[PDB]
DNA sequence: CACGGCTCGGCCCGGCG
DNA sequence: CGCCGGGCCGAGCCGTG
């Protein structure tokens, strides 16, 4: 029996879309600290970790702690119906429904039957990540879209003070180098030579929904999963975990 | 209770060739202004000398004589002339064809159609890729426009059919079918089955032989057929309207020809009401004389005046008399003698006699007591075949109950089997946990294995050069085409049932033989492609207790 | 015979001649009789609405291919509710009321 | 002195990527026939009699009077009243060839299997047909060097189609085989043979498998694929350790569902890998024993040769083997009853002319030399299956070919069917 | 009368069924057919056609399309392998399966009767005819469509020796056979029409068939 | 072994698209004077003549003269990945590859395997062109899009001081007149009555990619091919040659 | 006899503009 | 606000089971 009030519903709908393009259902671990999400793709190739501290909400009213079970598709269509500045509200009382209130010029109320979600909890804390880089959003977004031309597996190469991406197919070749000197490369933390490869499809699901004013974190080691991260209103950030190939 | 739509939906019998595109939509070919090359028949206005594939003249409006063609000398002869020549050329020893591969201007024709019938707002007008009838005489376009305008589909003879699973009845409570007792007094139904005078909407009347209670589907479609037949009477033939149907309950009393598949003699019937289910009821003499088995058979139901106005043998395909056929003749009077056999065994007793029930216990074969219980063979010849039947058990409604099977609201095989075998845990009788799977599980094994065996022996085929080379051309190009060859039985097919079949094995006690067969077929699917789809994407959470690996660890 | 083939999605309702399947009642309702059966609509609902008014369930005793058609007077299923109570469910509307708690369908009832 | 010369694990293949998965496959078969055409083409162009080779697409540039040779894949093969009408296709284009009834190799062209690589010498009519006079199959060297004799006689033995676990398995006869190798023999001659046999080979179906055909379950004495291979291990374990065994899958083993077959699935076939004195080889495989070239196949395609060649009947299975040796390819049919797995590079092609050819899988014993080649079909150990009855099959179980290494020849056709 | 004629035949058939029933009136009408009471048909094969069609029509009560969709043709052939004598050859088609075995089986009876009325000879197949036919049985049952009753080969040769008329027609599937190019069988493919009429017909319903023989007293079927 | 530097990659990609929509492969006759292109449709109905003087390039470095052979489709996808102001670079050394360097916010390098092109050179100099007209781009673009409604063959009529276009189908009629008095008709050079007809499809392939600030030249005579032209950065202009119908 | 996968146009966008 | 490149869906369209 809670209520929640979040402003800028279009943003929240965007991020919920982001989580949506990989999994179809998911549960929301609502605690008085904040709203939490954590789930994995069907393929067991990517891990979506959503963290929402209550501070971000214009109002945050939780009485206890409970897990919501919702159809990410239905919620995605619903939240997608919100716009730029209309206010989002999330209410839940006794009954087994979630009430979404979009109030901008007017109030609109939706109800979503909650669905049971068999939870498979796999918490994966910090791991041996050789290199760690921060980079503007549109840099990586452009890059992935480029590797979409020539292949389906994008290879990452992290060298001392230099970050380079690449991909090769039958004939064509794609390369994207950039270093700290370059503008888009905000930071590089080189411990040593790192190299990996990742499913360009999964990356495309990842980086869609990124403007130029989007900073992204990338930790990873030689032939091991990437962990990507980026903040949301500077408090609650999302983190993906992508297993490499080969 | 669907409609009868040809496989490519049709709405007019007029050959268009490729000129309409994929769905052979004539109106695209019109507005795109293309020109067609399709075998057709032309008629010639004797008065004026106009030529065109229509029946009446544009110049003067008289009937136009058929034009015959020599396939050698391409000679054209009006009908009476080719009648003299016995339809064989004078300077060619060949038979005169009625048709010829010709040049059609869909634009001016369709314009003449809209001009004739005064209808312009057709979304599309799906035609026929090619006349298959012998004459290859095309239907007039006007009728196609009227079909499209009302959105009713056509079948190969020119009649509009409506499949419905048929079930029997012999007595009905006018509550059930939604009919006023005064109306039933207008159809002839005087007295209910015990002879008492019909006064109330809860007395069981006896269905007379050729009445039928249509499903409201059939109402909702045959209504459209009624508006069609009106607009065809008036706009095209110039006659008074005939049905004036506005709700479905206007049809009550209008005859429908019930026709089977596989036969060519339909039975005239009368409509007397509607129910809600998807099954068109009828007196079993009807369903028998239509040759049905009523062990689930499905039948066609067209309106009378439609089949009269729109049928002609000339449209009948020439060679493949298939599973459906057309009302070559219609019966107008049941006689249960020459109906069928399977009717002749019905039990028409009001209650099974005591002697029977005691007579079962020693398992007497049925013919040892046929003389006791009345039947239909025990009333043939007499006039009281039609007069009075009976029935042991009342229902409350003929339609009460879930009116659409849960089978059709189930999309994915993955959970198809989860419902199908969801049930069998519920019942005592089925004992899934070992045999609903294994029977069904055996079916899963066969399809996957068959596909796997076949895959390595398949054929190839292009979208545009249908010609599929029993082998890949090293180039990957194609004849006529400069394109690519698609794979016939795609790898998405081989893997289509592994999820389910693996599910069943991980859940339900199934004989080890089939389990090892399935895990083994998993390994075969992988090692069949260990050199085209290499193992690339590692996964981070390994072994969620898969039965294959955890089996092998034994 | 009927259990020879099981297409996916086609439920099996009772093993051959097994007590718990369609208890048999000679007779011929208004609808049935030519070649169809009758059946208590309750048993059409408690099987999660697979059966309808006309779904050809393949039989075994009288002959392959019986259509189904409602007959409300014969006796529908006996079920076991989730809370352990045993309930005789003869009529339609009661079946709609308790379809959700059906923990076990002991007896498919008449045919 | 053995050597696992040719092995399909020994070579590595790489898929050439071009969202749709099917496009990658189709390409993969294309590459398959590609490497076919290159390999067999090269082999024909190692022929002295074959000169003036030309692209088929360039047959317009050659005169109607210049004698040219073409090497191509036989698309189709249509016989008529005046000869044969082929549609050969090389990497450039397609051409229709004709061979008159009265050419020397006309019988040869009669017995060629579709989808092979053949060579024609002749003259291209400008009408759109290549009138050929001489037929060419990759075939075999007619004059081959003898080899240096060995230090002394040493033998190897042929067997195949063990079909363990099937109740048809003539276990007793096989048991007297195992005694036979162990010196418990009845003549001094056989004791000298056994004294010097160092090599044993097994060419497929070493367990009757699972789900191989409708109703296999009725026949399985051991309906557990694990137990099939395991019990097979318990049979073969009794082999004297001073012999080496080579074993290759068939279409019944726990191996690939097409050909070629890299190896037994380790997960299922672990028990036989554990054998100390055995060496697990692929299908096909080639083993050089003292410089001797042993082609070993399980030979699915013999069913093809007899399937398409009326005039080759069973009980004489040396003939089809002669066909497959003559086209230098182990199953050049496609889409019939032999499955060819979409790899890039055809490994089936008989690259080097070997010394001896072992096959099986039809269980009809036979041996025949062709141009210095010892074709041989190590028949079986399975009595006739009911299923084999329904398809008109007649086994010759418990017939063991005995081979000397030196002359590369079969020497003694044991028969043990009296013990079954 | 309106399906397959000839003209006016209904008036007679109503009377003859009024006296004798269905089965008997069938054969009586056959007689008046060959006796020309309804006019001249022309060649002998046209009288064969008419009488066979009207016969089978009256027998199935005209509610099916066997008399039209099924019986492809009717011909008069000669035992050119045996003695060059005449016999009657029936050409079915696949859609005959639609009208079930019984109507199929009755097609045999009329085929036997008509040729007798036309003074024709029994059929006398050679062993290549017979064995090709049984081959058609095994292949057609094996791959094309499972017969309702699958008869043994000996039963098949039994019928092959004991049906005085030829059960044939145009081949229905692209399935080549082994007894190729038999005298008179102008195709080497499976004839599902002849096959089904053979197996699911006289075989599958021989009981009811000899019931009609008994109701008609037609000799040659013991 | 050259290098080339062109600014405004999006523009160049646009024109390369323009050439792309008619032919699928083509060769670039690079000379120290400039980059040249010349090719014809498969249908032999249109002739694309590209002329690029070296002056247009911010840097132009050719050492000798050579012909490039490239897949117009692959190059089209590549160049299409450039944006408004990012800089384009074209490099080629010993190997048989073309290196495309898109450097705006960052540098991105692509490589394209060059393809042999069987050259069929047909040079067609000035021909008898009765009328010659200049007109704004969007005028003709609108006009062609209009004739797309009623027919597939657009008819052109040039009279003294007046230019008129038209097309007729089954019942619909389309007409577009304009003269020197009108704004969009910059110039008319009437020698005498000219009339022709052209494939509306081909014209649609032609005029796509034209803003209002686009001047177009049109020379043609009675029942003979049109020659269209328009400049690119005022130095290197493109010229199409369309055969008439009937 | 009947299902799913696969590819194809036709609307329905979100982002560039 | 328009366009245009992608997205999502309804349509064949096949195949095979
Ligand atoms: Fe074998
Ligand atoms: Zn006129
Ligand atoms: Zn002529
Ligand atoms: Zn093609
Ligand atoms: Zn084998």
Residue numbers in the entry:
A (entry chain C), F (entry chain E): 2 to 247
B (entry chain B): 662 to 1215
C (entry chain B): 329 to 439
D (entry chain A): 196 to 213, 218 to 619
E (entry chain B): 52 to 273
Wording from the paper:
The bacterial sliding clamp is referred to as the β clamp, whereas the eukaryotic and archaeal sliding clamp protein is called the proliferative cell nuclear antigen (PCNA). Hence, across every domain of life, the extraordinary efficacy of the replicative polymerase complex is dependent on their interaction with sliding clamps, which encircle DNA and greatly enhance their processivity. We have shown that PolD uses two distinct PIP-boxes for molecular recognition of PCNA, which are located in the C-terminal region of their DP2 subunit.
Here we present the cryo-EM structure of the DNA-bound PolD–PCNA complex from Pyrococcus abyssi at 3.77 Å using an integrative structural biology approach, combining cryo-EM, X-ray crystallography, protein–protein interaction measurements, and activity assays. A defining feature of the PolD–PCNA–DNA ternary complex is its compactness: the radius of the PCNA ring and the clamp-like PolD DNA-binding domain match perfectly. Interaction with PCNA nearly doubles the positively charged surface formed by the PolD active site, making a 60 Å-long DNA-binding site. Although the DNA bound by the PolD–PCNA complex is predominantly in the B-form, interaction with the PolD clamp causes a distortion of the DNA region located next to the active site. Although PolD extensively interacts with the nascent DNA duplex, the PCNA channel exposes several positively charged residues, which are pointed towards the DNA backbone and make labile transient polar contacts with DNA. The cryo-EM map shows how PCNA is tethered to PolD through multiple contacts that involve both clamp-1 and clamp-2 domains of DP2. First, the α-helices, α-40, and α-41 of the clamp-1 domain are connected by a loop of 17 amino acids, which is hooked into PCNA. This loop binds to the canonical PCNA PIP-binding pocket through an internal PIP-box (iPIP), which has never been identified so far.
